[PDB]
Amino acid sequence: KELVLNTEGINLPELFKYAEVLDLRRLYSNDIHAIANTYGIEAALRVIEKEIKDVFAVYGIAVDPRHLSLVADYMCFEGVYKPLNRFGIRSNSSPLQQMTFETSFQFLKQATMLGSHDELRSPSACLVVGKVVRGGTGLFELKQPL
Amino acid sequence: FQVRTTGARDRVTNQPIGGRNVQGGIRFGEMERDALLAHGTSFLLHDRLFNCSDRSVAHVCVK
Amino acid sequence: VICPDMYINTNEIGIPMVFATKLTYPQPVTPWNVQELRQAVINGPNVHP
Amino acid sequence: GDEMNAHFPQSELGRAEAYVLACTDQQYLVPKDGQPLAGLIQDHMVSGA
Amino acid sequence: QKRITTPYMTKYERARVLGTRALQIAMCAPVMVELEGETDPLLIAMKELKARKIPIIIRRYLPDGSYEDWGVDELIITD
Amino acid sequence: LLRRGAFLSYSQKIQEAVKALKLESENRNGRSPGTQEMLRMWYELDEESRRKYQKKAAACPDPSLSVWRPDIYFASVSETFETKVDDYSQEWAAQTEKSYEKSELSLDRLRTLLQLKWQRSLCEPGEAVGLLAAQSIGEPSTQMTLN
Amino acid sequence: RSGYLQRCIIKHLEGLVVQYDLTVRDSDGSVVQFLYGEDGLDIPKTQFL
Amino acid sequence: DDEEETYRLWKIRKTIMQLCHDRGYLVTQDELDQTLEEFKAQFGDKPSEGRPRRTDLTVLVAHNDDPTDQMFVFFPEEPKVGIKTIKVYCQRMQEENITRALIVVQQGMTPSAKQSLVDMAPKYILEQFLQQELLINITEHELVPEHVVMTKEEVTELLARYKLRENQLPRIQAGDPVARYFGIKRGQVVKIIRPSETAGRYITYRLVQ
Amino acid sequence: AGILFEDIFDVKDIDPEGKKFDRVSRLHCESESFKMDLILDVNIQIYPVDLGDKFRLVIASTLYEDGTLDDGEYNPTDDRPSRADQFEYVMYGKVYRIEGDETSTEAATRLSAYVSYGGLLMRLQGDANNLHGFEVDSRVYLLMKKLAF
RNA sequence: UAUGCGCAUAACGCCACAGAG
Numbered sequence: 017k018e019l020v021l022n023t024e025g026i027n028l029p030e031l032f033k034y035a036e037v038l039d040l041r042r043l044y045s046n047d048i049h050a051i052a053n054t055y056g057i058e059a060a061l062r063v064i065e066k067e068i069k070d071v072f073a074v075y076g077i078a079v080d081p082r083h084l085s086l087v088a089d090y091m092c093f094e095g096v097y098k099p100l101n102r103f104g105i106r107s108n109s110s111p112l113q114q115m116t117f118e119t120s121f122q123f124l125k126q127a128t129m130l131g132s133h134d135e136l137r138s139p140s141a142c143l144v145v146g147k148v149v150r151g152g153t154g155l156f157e158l159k160q161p162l
Numbered sequence: 163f164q165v166r167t168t169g170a171r172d173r174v175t176n177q178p179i180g181g182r183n184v185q186g187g188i189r190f191g192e193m194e195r196d197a198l199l200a201h202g203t204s205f206l207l208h209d210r211l212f213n214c215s216d217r218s219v220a221h222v223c224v225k
Numbered sequence: 226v227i228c229p230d231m232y233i234n235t236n237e238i239g240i241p242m243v244f245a246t247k248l249t250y251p252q253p254v255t256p257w258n259v260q261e262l263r264q265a266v267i268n269g270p271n272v273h274p
Numbered sequence: 275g276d277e278m279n280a281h282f283p284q285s286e287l288g289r290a291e292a293y294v295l296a297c298t299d300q301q302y303l304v305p306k307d308g309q310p311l312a313g314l315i316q317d318h319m320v321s322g323a
Numbered sequence: 324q325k326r327i328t329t330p331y332m333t334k335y336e337r338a339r340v341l342g343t344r345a346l347q348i349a350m351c352a353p354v355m356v357e358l359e360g361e362t363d364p365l366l367i368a369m370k371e372l373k374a375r376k377i378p379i380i381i382r383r384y385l386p387d388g389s390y391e392d393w394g395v396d397e398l399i400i401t402d
Numbered sequence: 403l404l405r406r407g408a409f410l411s412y413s414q415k416i417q418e419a420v421k422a423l424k425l426e427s428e429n430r431n432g433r434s435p436g437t438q439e440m441l442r443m444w445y446e447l448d449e450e451s452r453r454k455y456q457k458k459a460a461a462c463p464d465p466s467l468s469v470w471r472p473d474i475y476f477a478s479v480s481e482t483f484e485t486k487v488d489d490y491s492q493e494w495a496a497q498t499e500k501s502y503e504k505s506e507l508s509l510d511r512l513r514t515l516l517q518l519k520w521q522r523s524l525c526e527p528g529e530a531v532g533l534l535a536a537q538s539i540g541e542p543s544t545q546m547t548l549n
Numbered sequence: 550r551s552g553y554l555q556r557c558i559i560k561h562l563e564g565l566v567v568q569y570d571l572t573v574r575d576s577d578g579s580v581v582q583f584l585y586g587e588d589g590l591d592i593p594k595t596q597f598l
Numbered sequence: 599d600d601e602e603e604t605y606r607l608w609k610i611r612k613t614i615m616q617l618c619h620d621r622g623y624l625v626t627q628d629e630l631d632q633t634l635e636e637f638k639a640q641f642g643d644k645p646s647e648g649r650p651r652r653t654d655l656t657v658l659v660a661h662n663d664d665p666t667d668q669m670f671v672f673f674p675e676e677p678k679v680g681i682k683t684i685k686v687y688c689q690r691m692q693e694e695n696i697t698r699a700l701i702v703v704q705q706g707m708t709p710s711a712k713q714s715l716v717d718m719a720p721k722y723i724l725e726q727f728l729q730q731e732l733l734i735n736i737t738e739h740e741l742v743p744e745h746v747v748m749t750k751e752e753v754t755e756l757l758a759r760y761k762l763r764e765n766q767l768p769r770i771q772a773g774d775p776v777a778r779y780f781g782i783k784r785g786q787v788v789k790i791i792r793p794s795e796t797a798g799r800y801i802t803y804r805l806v807q
Numbered sequence: 808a809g810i811l812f813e814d815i816f817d818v819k820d821i822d823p824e825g826k827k828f829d830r831v832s833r834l835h836c837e838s839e840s841f842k843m844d845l846i847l848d849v850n851i852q853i854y855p856v857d858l859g860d861k862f863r864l865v866i867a868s869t870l871y872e873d874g875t876l877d878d879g880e881y882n883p884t885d886d887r888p889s890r891a892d893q894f895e896y897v898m899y900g901k902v903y904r905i906e907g908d909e910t911s912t913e914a915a916t917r918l919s920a921y922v923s924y925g926g927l928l929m930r931l932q933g934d935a936n937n938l939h940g941f942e943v944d945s946r947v948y949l950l951m952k953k954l955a956f
Numbered sequence: 957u958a959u960g961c962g963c964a965u966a967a968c969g970c971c972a973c974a975g976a977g
Contacts, residue, residue: 032733056776059741077542080307082586083535095769100561109577117560137576146212151530151566152202153339159380165247200533201296205287236298258362290342303593306538329473333526387761414627432657468801480588481798503943523594532565540555578766588797
């Protein structure tokens with residue numbers, strides 16, 4: 017039966033003044049950017065993974081923790097908290113996957129200006145050129161001994 | 163009901179056409195592609211989306 | 226349209242004769258399945274199998 | 275009044291990975307949280323009880 | 324070198340081994356086992372997988388480009 | 403949760419009450435005279451006895467999953483699973499003496515059962531876990547109303 | 550609203566498969582996880598563990 | 599004033615002592631467990647009167663491999679710090695052949711002095727911290743995992759086990775708060791022990807870019 | 808003999824927990840010779856039992872005194888003599904748990920034994936000197952008959 | 957490409973309404 021502060025609004029280093037009254041070891045926040053700028057990126061990763069669980073747990077829905085850990089490990093791959101939209105797909109290696117997602121003409125224009133190479137290992141890029149996708153039954157090849 | 167074994171193809175893309183009155187094909191769209199990637203069946207997508215829509219043979223200069 | 230069926234197994238689907246005499250499979254002819262394919266060729270495109 | 279699409283694989287590779295991988299028997303648990311999603315429904319759970 | 328991957332055949336490998344071998348028996352490849360009246364090449368390929376009589380090599384590509392070779396005889400198959 | 407180190411242990415457990423004797427000096431640069439005496443003792447008064455304080459304050463080893471590959475090394479399970487199997491081993495050891503009609507099962511073959519099942523429950527190489535994670539965030543979202 | 554979200558998440562996370570070293574890598578070799586789900590296990594098979 | 603600036607100086611001394619121990623410098627147990635009364639005994643009270651001056655609190659820790667690389671921690675007097683102060687600090691470092699310092703400002707530096715601290719060579723590695731972000735050790739938080747900097751022999755066997763390039767490994771920024779805590783150069787790989795909930799502990803790796 | 812237990816019981820209560828399954832009454836009984844008490848589900852269409860009924864309860868491992876052959880296969884055609892010819896209500900079920908209390912002293916004068924007759928349950932609790940023949944997964948025959956006094 | 961008997965005929969989009977799950 018502990019007592020908990022709850023503020024509508026965020027200033028993480030403001031609460032560091034009051035380290036003798038508040039348990040700042042267990043500070044939590046909704047803003048993943050505030051946690052990413054105060055406690056690092058590996059803390060913001062656990063904030064993402066906990067926030068998606070808190071979204072689904074209002075409705076009695078339990079998504080397994082391994083899915084959330086993979087999604088947060090992807091969105092925090094580059095040291096920053098990146099969105100899953102057409103501005104985070106600019107970092108992608110494959111121009112064809114960027115074209116098949118959104119604004120195909122802008123990514124086509126960037127790939128033509130930069131002279132971009134596609135290694136054809138994305139699942140979208142293997143299906144544009146009619147090649148068997150690398151995941152699943154395509155990570156390997158079969159050889160016939162002579 | 164409708165069933166399409168082979169038939170007419172779109173004159174731009176050489177994929178089957180849509181409609182059951184024109185005796186056409188049904189889509190294997192994007193979410194079906196996604197859910198069949200999740201199975202790990204890659205030759206089954208290669209079937210549905212390359213051998214049974216448009217397998218053409220182009221000529222390239224290898225140089 | 227789908228309808229229920231209990232008297233097929235759980236891993237089964239019920240295919241009508243409308244579709245079964247229209248959907249084909251390209252079975253190559255080997256010496257160990259030529260009797261089955263030969264009876265299937267004799268039956269023809271409107272008699273199942 | 276629901277409708278369902280029945281795709282018919284035309285290669286031995288597609289057949290062999292539809293028997294092994296995408297079979298109904300292997301889809302017993304949902305990938306969301308590993309809980310079952312094949313099970314009996316309405317009349318059966320009354321008469322079994 | 325020493326092969327450092329799984330000794331078990333994964334579920335994605337037996338699908339493609341049975342697919343390739345049933346496509347071979349779809350042509351007139353010789354059958355290593357005794358046909359007990361089967362006409363389906365998948366059932367014959369499953370009997371050949373169970374009897375450890377498939378000679379195909381799985382080349383397991385690692386994501387740098389490197390590989391290592393496994394016969395299906397030296398993989399542990401399960402149900 | 404507490405901190406470790408060779409010099410930290412040597413100053414903590416050993417030379418605290420020794421430097422608790424009076425010294426009567428000043429802070430040179432942010433340091434007490436007791437800390438300067440412990441630095442002097444650590445530098446000169448130790449020679450290959452600091453190997454003792456070095457090895458008695460080494461870090462915890464990495465988990466087995468990062469050191470030994472769980473697909474090719476048997477019993478290389480998770481730490482949570484090892485805790486769970488140890489608790490169930492202790493709790494199951496009581497029921498073979500208390501509860502009647504013992505069932506010809508041992509501790510070690512039960513541990514081997516659970517460890518082999520943990521090894522066989524791994525993801526096979528090839529599994530598109532990103533599509534599964536995407537479709538597992540997206541499909542329950544249809545059962546979530548708006549505001 | 551639920552469809553465009555799932556589309557965006559799929560078009561980012563589609564390249565992530567488990568390799569033969571047990572690392573979840575993107576299609577360009579970028580290592581996202583060193584073990585899948587921080588323990589390496591499959592969700593349908595952790596149910597009786 | 600008093601009894602509040604002494605508390606702030608006690609906390610930002612304790613935090614930089616924990617920082618210097620975590621980076622691997624020789625810090626005693628009494629110097630880590632220094633209570634506020636022991637701080638009023640060692641250094642003075644009444645900083646407004648000036649018995650603790652911020653010049654008087656400058657520490658010099660030394661590293662446990664050899665005592666050739668020791669590090670200053672400066673607490674500068676002026677609130678807004680310009681290049682005129684850090685030139686004096688570099689002149690203090692050049693005498694005793696110090697290759698690394700750490701300036702704890704109380705309002706932020708000017709961006710010209712920021713570019714000056716970057717603009718020093720490998721001869722002078724100067725870092726800067728706000729006082730406000732040293733009131734608590736961020737690595738003691740429950741979400742912050744344990745970060746371990748790796749030697750170049752461990753990075754080699756890392757990239758050899760997975761047959762991996764440093765271009766493929768995940769990133770951590772060099773302005774990340776825990777990379778600034780552990781003082782990590784760009785190009786070094788940081789081993790991270792996550793307190794996982796599905797596994798017990800989980801080893802991941804990130805490169806500093 | 809293959810008799811595992813034999814006593815004369817007396818119905819002290821009927822359905823105390825108040826659950827009232829159709830065609831089934833739970834009889835909480837209590838013994839005469841021993842410290843035993845009984846909880847028993849009986850079929851009360853074919854064999855009704857009232858409060859205060861005194862009945863003779865026998866638990867056997869077989870129905871044949873000429874050697875415990877222990878078939879378990881059911882021939883209705885066998886007109887050979889049985890134990891069941893001297894009783895009125897006969898069941899057949901499996902012992903699914905036995906339990907007691909012990910703290911380094913085995914079978915310390917309390918030993919429950921839970922028997923299920925195809926879903927009609929039964930515990931037979933008392934001193935463990937009478938509960939020896941029971942073990943888990945064993946097949947037993949209940950054989951009860953109302954005594955007319 | 958489909959139908960009919962190598963031969964003869966037919967070789968589509970865009971809006972807007974309405975509907976199914």
